[PDB]
Design a protein around this motif. Structure first.
Motif, mmCIF file in Angstrom:
data_model
loop_
_atom_site.group_PDB
_atom_site.id
_atom_site.type_symbol
_atom_site.label_atom_id
_atom_site.label_comp_id
_atom_site.label_asym_id
_atom_site.label_seq_id
_atom_site.Cartn_x
_atom_site.Cartn_y
_atom_site.Cartn_z
ATOM 1 N N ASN A 1 22.805 -14.885 25.719
ATOM 2 C CA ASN A 1 21.414 -15.138 25.600
ATOM 3 C C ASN A 1 20.755 -14.487 24.718
ATOM 4 O OD1 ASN A 1 18.535 -14.944 26.740
ATOM 5 N ND2 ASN A 1 19.133 -14.587 28.682
ATOM 6 N N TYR A 2 20.173 -14.941 23.938
ATOM 7 C CA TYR A 2 19.228 -14.363 22.899
ATOM 8 C C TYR A 2 18.329 -13.435 22.976
ATOM 9 C CZ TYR A 2 21.561 -16.867 18.736
ATOM 10 O OH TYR A 2 22.262 -17.329 17.740
ATOM 11 N N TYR B 1 23.844 -24.898 21.148
ATOM 12 C CA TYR B 1 23.313 -25.232 22.500
ATOM 13 C C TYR B 1 24.064 -26.709 22.580
ATOM 14 C CZ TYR B 1 19.089 -22.147 22.802
ATOM 15 O OH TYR B 1 18.446 -20.894 22.784
ATOM 16 N N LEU C 1 23.785 -22.160 25.988
ATOM 17 C CA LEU C 1 24.430 -21.534 24.986
ATOM 18 C C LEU C 1 25.781 -21.687 25.083
ATOM 19 C CD1 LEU C 1 23.483 -20.187 22.241
ATOM 20 C CD2 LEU C 1 23.843 -17.973 23.257
HETATM 21 CL CL CL Z 1 19.637 -18.259 24.052
#
Ligand code: CL
Ligand code: CL
Lengths: 70, 70
Positions: free
Chosen positions: A17-18, A50, A55
């Motif tokens: 998760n960025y 993605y 992701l």
């Molecule tokens: Cl992300």
């Protein structure tokens, strides 16, 4: 490869998760993405993607992950 | 990733010559190639390639090389 780019890669690899990685690293998401983008541009392979809105760690991402723990 | 597969990868990465790596490792060339082949099958990316009759380190090969020295 630079210590801080490696640290960002591992954080994103762990969080998947960025924005979450950014919060953890106390830097902005675009900063996180620039670190990753530099590695991907430097080595010519994608590390994340993605797929159907989720992701994924790419094949090169998994190779990097395991190599860094050796 | 296993110590011995890593060692074979680094030797070939250094020699850029599989038969030479085998001589250095005191194992047969097919053994060298099986170690490499296992990594490539496991991670789904090629590490080496021939291009116009000359051995090349692939983009994933270079990423592995640098990650192992970090
Ligand atoms: Cl992300
Ligand atoms: Cl060869």
């Amino acid at each position: 490869m630079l210590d801080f780019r490696v640290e960002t890669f591992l954080t994103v690899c762990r969080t998947m998760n960025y924005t979450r990685a950014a919060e953890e690293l106390n830097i902005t998401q675009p900063a996180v993405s620039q670190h990753i983008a530099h590695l991907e541009r430097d080595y010519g392979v994608p590390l994340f993607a993605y797929r159907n809105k989720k992701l994924q760690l790419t094949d090169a991402g998994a190779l990097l992950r395991d190599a860094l723990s050796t």
